[PDB]
Design a protein around this nucleic acid. Structure first.
Lengths: 23, 1339
RNA sequence: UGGGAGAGGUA
């Protein structure tokens, strides 16, 4: 969820986990 | 005994000892034994740490690594070699592993490749024979730790919500490792949960995460009052034992009898009525259930809709719907106001989650917030938190305490938690909130276990093992299979790095105190509340720093530091042990039917809280029972009077409470505890002096401390002494203790003038003579501060208690000049200076006597090779070793070009950077050690040191071969006289040629030739030992990267006492020497003997240490007995007179337990005993078992001295007489290590700090005294504005001001011109570098 | 040279 974090690598992992993986 | 027949201490204790004082270093040695030892199944240490991680599968399962067995190789160096070379004393860890490959192309392809090679997993530092570790050449001690035990502890607070002043009960589950779990309460009576002290969730979230619905939660946490509705009037099956004192909501009814009326509260007589009628069903009005909460999920069975779920307050329309729906039997929960609280109901109402998945994503949202929670991620996190052994453990001590506190029965169990455990903790906390039960004692010694050195190093080994197990599992996942050895995938870096990090720089790996043997033994028996997992020093309250009543016999109450470390550092008592779980236990004698037996039970901290235990100061007779009826005891914390038959146990000794160092104080029971604490502290700071001197007043614990410290040399096998030296003792063993395959010759190499950690002197002086017979367990060499096997930290001083002209004003001490003449408190202080030759990138340095631009006077002390001679008395500002450094070319002038043309010194500008002795330091040179790296040819001086060490080692190996061939030729003589009878023909011929004699070929001839070739291979292994020793002392050292050679120089100073040196007795009477008075100025009695020390009498009746005065009187008596024995010996009376008088002095006490009888003593032993007693008879006095004043006065009457203790002294100077009698006797004074040679410092100008430009801090680097904030306030209160500006600017960080002040003072003009201090410009630049424009605004 | 930790101690 947007909001309750301050770890930058956790926010980056959350950002990269939305685009799907190619075949 | 043999070391005790030479001087016997008179014992004044009246009670027997049924249990001797144990080995004082069993805690450290036993903990490291359990770590390092090989056990099959009772998992301890390295085998447990190997089984905790092995085996390991792959990422798939196609291969795995099995552990077979481990072993430990021999150490490369002995302990003295590591202490010389500056390397740790360790051992190689060699462990057999098994690597199998699972053929995944097969269904179960078990055997494909079986590898079993020897793997080397780092190093572990071993513990020596005294309990210490040698880490990087220095000697350390791993202090034991006292942390909270794993388990559950139901504590509470004391009024933290001051809006009500309520109590808020809370549980806490502590694992050994893993996430903590804490249940608690609020002011609104709701159960909550914190995991790892994070944000509060409602406590049914963990229950719904445990796959429990609301219904099963209510069945687990409540009971059912059952309601049945019949013809639209309500009835309730009531158990009568649910109504206590509250009023009735209605006039209750039975079949035909009225019992409790409306508005009438129900009594216990009414409880007896409703149990004597045995009614079952009771009708009830409508409004009585308006307030109850339904506990059962109910659905309309006709249609299929939810009419009411669990935990909702039912209403009038809801009960009408329940009557009309067909569910004519409702189950509601039974609540109450007093005991059965509605806690779980209110938490289920507060509880926002509704099922397992929503509770799991709530737990995931709490634990790893700011992430998208998924089903399997939340599930795997919640499993790995508590219910997975690889990330959570209780280690069976937590399981023992868990089942103990939950009132269970089974001890062992699962290491992980479970659902029954969590609901049992919640049920117990709810019982505490009810009122049945009690909170735990948090500072108990049953809640605090001991985590010793073996357990701590086992845990650090496990941490390194998982840190390498992760990487080797990763490598086994993806690597090749046929050629994959275990060796190239096992890396010894993380395990060795973790265990070396722990042993070198943990918070519990302490540099050992080595002032006297008592210092080291008290360090090795120490208990620390701080460290990893324990407390912290700044945020500990008064409750952890107090003497809990369970410290009786386990932890000393009068030995601890007196600073900010006071309750947090403790000391183990004398008889204290540990469990197998780590709880402290102390021995007691079990009494049976009044008969106090000699059976010994070690009771732990909680077991003794049930029984009545007698005091050790209770009287016994005929090995029977108590002499009185109303006997004192202690039980359940408190201590009160009890009957003589009720008692369950007795203390094993009178010194069971106090520690080691607190049980060396004579007359401790007459001391105030604030001064006894300081005396026990200050005994550990006493430097060892030149000649050891036993206390005339002691305890008898001195021989135990001196033997058990390992600082002496005890005899391993008894026998007779063949050869004594200043540095060697050679003992011929008795043939009974001799083994049938040896010679029977033990060698003791005494360590001479070795430096201690506190720079004091350590040397072993031999206390035996030539041809003296010894036994197994007697002292052969007195250590640093021991005397004939008794601990001797100071000297016995003739002490007078009187004020002397203000020279003992406020804890000051006046000392005669005879104490300085006779060199009594003169100590030796050995100091090591080093010189490292490093590889500068401009050129390698060299150590040669060729030093530029210095005078040839200083070159006389050096040799021709550049090192100082052994024996040269150096002073401050002198040179010890000449090391020059290449400065650098950096210019091409014709002068240096002609220089490098004529000579070839191609770095003819060199900067002399020789090691010089620091200023104020003096003394001779007693030892020079030169280490070198490989490849570099060393020096002539290093060759000479090498040749000397080679000759010494060769002489030792030659004596070893001589005694071994002596034992082997004794064995061939034994088998020759067993075979035949040849006595004269073997000894008429020399012993070395005992091989060419022969006879007919038989079994004895075969044995003769086989022991011949055994002697040949003995010679073979002898020259192999020679070659190994030679290559070991000829191989270059494994020095640090960047150095070439290291020269270490050892100095030795003798420091006589002087004004300003600190001195103390044993009862917390410290003092500073103020003057050294001549013998013609000291006061004297009418025999003309002046007093050695004049103490102040006004220090006694405020501090209440009367053991000072009693030790003075008993020392006066003991010295009087020694004076009479010395008079008889000087007159050379007889042996009968000496035997009679010494016997009369020995059997003198009231009903004492010591029975010495000189009738068995032969006359040479009586003369030897009188010679050792001619300086005063030593007297034992156990703590809380002392000598009375009647026995002190009896000994004073024997010694022909005054009974009241006081003689008439005369003035030293005027010759007149002091108007009152003065207490004169013999106290035992110590010389503490706070010497004015180390405290005295002064500085006019020196170096400055780099950033702040202020003078340095420290005597080591010639610093300035810190004029702090409070002194700035004091000058501001005076008004000294110019003195304050002088302090702040020109004696400090103002550069132009301080240069101008120096040259103005030398110019004779005392005037300053001050400016801005450079720390203010540092401050301006730092506030500017914070992006904030600060500037001095000009006007 | 000279900085930072950790440990112990003195008043």
């Amino acid at each position: 969820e947007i909001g309750r974090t301050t770890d930058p690598v956790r926010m980056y992992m959350r950002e990269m986990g939305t685009v799907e993986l190619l075949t | 005994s043999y070391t005790e027949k030479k001087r016997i201490r008179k014992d004044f204790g009246k009670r027997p000892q049924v249990l001797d004082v144990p080995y004082l270093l069993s805690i450290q040695l036993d903990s490291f034994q359990k770590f390092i030892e090989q056990d099959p199944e009772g998992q301890y240490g390295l085998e447990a740490a190997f089984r905790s991680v092995f085996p390991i599968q792959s990422y798939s399962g196609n291969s795995e690594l099995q552990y077979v067995s481990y072993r430990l190789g021999e150490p490369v160096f002995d302990v003295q070699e590591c202490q010389i070379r500056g390397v740790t004393y360790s051992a190689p860890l060699r462990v057999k592993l098994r690597l199998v490959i699972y053929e995944r192309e097969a269904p179960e392809g078990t055997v494909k490749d079986i590898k079993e090679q020897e793997v080397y997993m780092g190093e572990i530092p071993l513990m020596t024979d005294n309990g210490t570790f040698v880490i990087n050449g220095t000697e350390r001690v791993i202090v034991s730790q006292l942390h909270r035990s794993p388990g559950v502890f139901f504590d509470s607070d004391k009024g933290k919500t001051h809006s009500s002043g309520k109590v808020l009960y809370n549980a806490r589950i502590i694992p050994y490792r893993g996430s903590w779990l804490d249940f608690e309460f609020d002011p609104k009576d709701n159960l909550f949960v914190r995991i790892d002290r994070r944000r509060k969730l409602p406590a049914t979230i963990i229950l719904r995460a445990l796959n429990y619905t609301t219904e099963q939660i209510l069945d687990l946490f409540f009971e059912k009052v059952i309601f049945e509705i019949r013809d639209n009037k309500l009835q309730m099956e009531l158990v009568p034992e649910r109504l206590r004192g509250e009023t009735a909501s209605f006039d209750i009814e039975a079949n035909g009898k009225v019992y409790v009326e409306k508005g009438r509260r129900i009594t216990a007589r009414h409880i007896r009525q409703l149990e004597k009628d045995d009614v079952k069903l009771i009708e009830v009005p409508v409004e009585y259930i308006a307030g109850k909460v339904v506990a059962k999920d109910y659905i309309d069975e006709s249609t299929g809709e939810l009419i009411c779920a669990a935990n909702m307050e039912l209403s009038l329309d809801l009960l009408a719907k329940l009557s009309q729906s067909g569910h004519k039997r409702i189950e509601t929960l039974f609540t109450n106001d007093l005991d059965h609280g509605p806690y779980i109901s209110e938490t289920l109402r507060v509880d926002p989650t509704n099922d397992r998945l929503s509770a799991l994503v709530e737990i995931y949202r709490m634990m790893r917030p700011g992430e998208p929670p998924t089903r399997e991620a939340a599930e795997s996190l919640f499993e790995n938190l508590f219910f997975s052994e690889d990330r959570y453990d209780l280690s069976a001590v937590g399981r023992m305490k868990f089942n103990r506190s939950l009132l269970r029965e089974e001890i062992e169990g699962s290491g992980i938690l479970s659902k029954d455990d969590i609901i049992d903790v919640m049920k117990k906390l709810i019982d505490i909130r009810n009122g049945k039960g009690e909170v735990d004692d948090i500072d108990h010694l049953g809640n605090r276990r001991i985590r010793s050195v073996g357990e701590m190093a086992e845990n650090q080994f496990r941490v390194g093992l998982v840190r390498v197990e992760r990487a080797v599992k990763e490598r086994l996942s993806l690597g090749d299979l046929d050629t994959l050895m275990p060796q190239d995938m096992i890396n010894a870096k993380p395990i060795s790095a973790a265990v070396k990090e722990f042993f070198g720089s943990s918070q519990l790996s302490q540099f050992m105190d080595q002032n006297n043997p008592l210092s080291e033994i008290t360090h090795k028996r120490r208990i620390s509340a701080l460290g990893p997992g324990g407390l912290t020093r700044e945020r500990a309250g008064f409750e952890v720093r107090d003497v809990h009543p369970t410290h009786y016999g386990r932890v000393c109450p009068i030995e601890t530091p007196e600073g900010p470390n006071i309750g947090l550092i403790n000391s183990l008592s004398v008889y204290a042990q540990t469990n197998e779980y780590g709880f402290l236990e102390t021995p007691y004698r079990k009494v049976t039917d009044g008969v106090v037996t000699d059976e010994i039970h070690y009771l732990s901290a909680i077991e003794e809280g049930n029984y009545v235990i007698a005091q050790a100061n209770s009287n016994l007779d005929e090995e029977g029972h108590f002499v009185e009826d109303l006997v004192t005891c202690r039980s359940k914390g408190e201590s009160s009077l009890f009957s003589r038959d009720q008692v369950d146990y007795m203390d094993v000794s009178t010194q069971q409470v106090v520690s080691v160092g607190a049980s060396l104080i004579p007359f401790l029971e007459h001391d105030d505890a604030n001064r006894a604490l300081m005396g026990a502290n200050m005994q550990r700071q006493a430097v060892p002096t030149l000649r050891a001197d036993k206390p005339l007043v002691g305890t008898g614990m001195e021989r135990a401390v001196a033997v058990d410290s390992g600082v002496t040399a005890v005899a391993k096998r008894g026998g007779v002494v063949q050869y004594v030296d200043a540095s060697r003792i050679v003992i011929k063993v008795n043939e009974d203790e001799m083994y049938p395959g040896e010679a029977g010759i033990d060698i003791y190499n005494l360590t001479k003038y070795t430096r201690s950690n506190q720079n004091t002197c350590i040397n072993q002086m031999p206390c035996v003579s030539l041809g003296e017979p010894v036994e197994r367990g007697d002292v052969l060499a007195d250590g640093p501060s021991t005397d004939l096997g008794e601990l001797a930290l100071g000297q016995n001083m003739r002490v007078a208690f009187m004020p002397w002209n203000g020279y003992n004003f406020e804890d000051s001490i006046l000392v005669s000049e005879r104490v300085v003449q006779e060199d009594r408190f003169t100590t030796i202080h050995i100091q090591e200076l080093a010189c490292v030759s490093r590889d500068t990138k401009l050129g390698p340095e060299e150590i040669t006597a060729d030093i530029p631009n210095v005078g040839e006077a200083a070159l006389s002390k050096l040799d021709e090779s550049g090192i100082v001679y052994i024996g040269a008395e150096v002073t401050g500002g002198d040179i010890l070793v000449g090391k020059v450094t290449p400065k650098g070319e950096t210019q091409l002038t014709p002068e240096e070009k002609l220089l490098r043309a004529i000579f070839g010194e191609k770095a003819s500008d060199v900067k002399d950077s020789s090691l010089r002795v620091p200023n104020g330091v003096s003394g001779t040179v007693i030892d020079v050690q030169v280490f070198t790296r490989d490849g570099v040819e060393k020096d002539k001086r290093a060759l000479e040191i090498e040749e000397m060490q080679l000759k010494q080692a060769k002489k030792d190996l030659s004596e070893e071969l001589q005694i071994l061939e002596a034992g082997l030729f004794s064995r061939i003589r034994a088998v020759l006289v067993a075979g035949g009878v040849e006595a004269e023909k073997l000894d008429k011929l020399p012993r070395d040629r005992w091989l060419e004699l022969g006879l007919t070929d038989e079994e004895k001839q075969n044995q003769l030739e086989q022991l011949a070739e055994q002697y040949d291979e003995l010679k073979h292994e002898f020259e192999k030992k020679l070659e190994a020793k030679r290559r070991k002392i000829t191989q270059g050292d494994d020095l640090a990267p960047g150095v070439l050679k290291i020269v270490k120089v050892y100095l030795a100073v003798k420091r006589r006492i002087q004004p300003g040196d600190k001195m103390a007795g044993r009862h917390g009477n410290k003092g500073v020497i103020s003057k050294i008075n001549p013998i013609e100025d000291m006061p004297y009695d009418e025999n003309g003997t002046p007093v050695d020390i004049v103490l102040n009498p006004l220090g006694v009746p405020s501090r209440m240490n009367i053991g000072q005065i009693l030790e003075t009187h008993l020392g006066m008596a003991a010295k009087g007995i020694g004076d009479k024995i010395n008079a008889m010996l000087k007159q050379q009376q007889e042996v009968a007179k000496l035997r009679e008088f010494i016997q009369r002095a020995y059997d003198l006490g009231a009903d004492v337990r010591q029975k010495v009888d000189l009738s068995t003593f032969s006359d040479e032993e009586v003369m030897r005993l009188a010679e050792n007693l001619r300086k005063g008879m030593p007297i034992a006095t156990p703590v809380f078992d002392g000598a009375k004043e009647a026995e002190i006065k009896e000994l004073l009457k024997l010694g022909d001295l005054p009974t009241s203790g006081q003689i008439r002294l005369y003035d030293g100077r005027t010759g007149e007489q002091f108007e009152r009698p003065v207490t004169v006797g013999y106290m035992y004074m110590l010389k503490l290590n706070h010497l004015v040679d180390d405290k005295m410092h002064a500085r006019s100008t020196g170096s400055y700090s780099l950033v702040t430009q202020q003078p340095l801090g420290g005597k080591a680097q010639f610093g300035g005294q810190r004029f702090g904030e409070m002194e700035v306030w004091a000058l501001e209160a005076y008004g000294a504005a110019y003195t304050l500006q002088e302090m702040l600017t020109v004696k400090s960080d103002d550069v132009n001001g301080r240069t101008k002040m120096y040259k103005n003072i030398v110019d004779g003009n005392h005037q300053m011109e001050p400016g801005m201090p450079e720390s203010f410009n540092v401050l301006l630049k730092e506030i500017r570098s914070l992006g904030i424009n600060i500037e001095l605004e000009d006007e």
